[PDB]
């Protein structure tokens with residue numbers, strides 16, 4: 001892999017995204033959607049051969065229930081985390097050593113390193129108040145909490161309302177320094193965030 005994408009999702013909007021109902025009530029919070037070893041050119045790696053097989057402890061799972069829930073059905077959390085490890089975590093060796101280290105690394109980014117996107121936005125005076133916002137104000141807020149580096153944003157359109165859904169912070173191969181995210185969505189895409197009137 002070349003770099004990492006750490007993607008967080010705003011639960012309220014995810015649960016308004018498609019024909020799959022969230023059986024559990026969402027919070028107005030950004031929690032983790034993925035940590036993806038990624039490639040600068042072409043497709044990202046997927047399902048890389050593993051180097052070890054490990055069991056998760058309850059305490060790790062309890063933190064992931066809070067920081068990385070399956071927002072559609074929390075009863076499917078274990079199989080959901082197993083797939084994130086198998087599809088993505090497995091491709092980050094040796095920076096990511098094993099399954100437990102993969103999830104501990106995500107918790108370290110979100111909590112210790114203050115990468116909780118709800119917190120970064122709140123520090124810039126942007127709360128989940130359901131207001132229409134300019135794209136640059138959301139981008140400026142994230143860059144101010146991420147070493148000036150440009151995030152990748154995902155939005156969705158619902159009727160006449162476009163809402164913010166995901167924010168990705170990208171980092172270098174070691175995951176120790178942020179980098180600008182390559183590959184932003186093109187304007188024709190229904191995942192593209194327009195310059196104005198984004199609801200959050």
Ligand SMILES: *[C@@H]1O[C@H](CO)[C@@H](O[C@@H]2O[C@H](CO)[C@@H](O[C@@H]3O[C@H](CO)[C@@H](O)[C@H](O[C@H]4O[C@H](CO)[C@@H](O)[C@H](O)[C@@H]4O)[C@@H]3O[C@@H]3OC[C@@H](O)[C@H](O)[C@H]3O)[C@H](O)[C@H]2NC(C)=O)[C@H](O)[C@H]1NC(C)=O
Nearest residue numbers: 028029030066067110111116117118119120122123127128
């Ligand atoms: C990801 O980041 C988000 C955004 O920062 C975290 O969510 C935010 O979490 C804080 C708590 O840490 C929460 O604030 C509390 O909200 C409740 C309900 O409205 C209040 O009752 C709380 O006030 C009481 O407690 C504080 C002590 O923390 C005390 O100072 C108050 O007087 C009172 O006893 C508290 O409100 C905060 O009070 C302090 C003030 O400085 C803050 O401005 C005010 O918010 C936020 O509501 C919550 N924000 C959101 C958008 O939900 C989230 O926890 C974090 N995720 C993880 C896993 O860490």
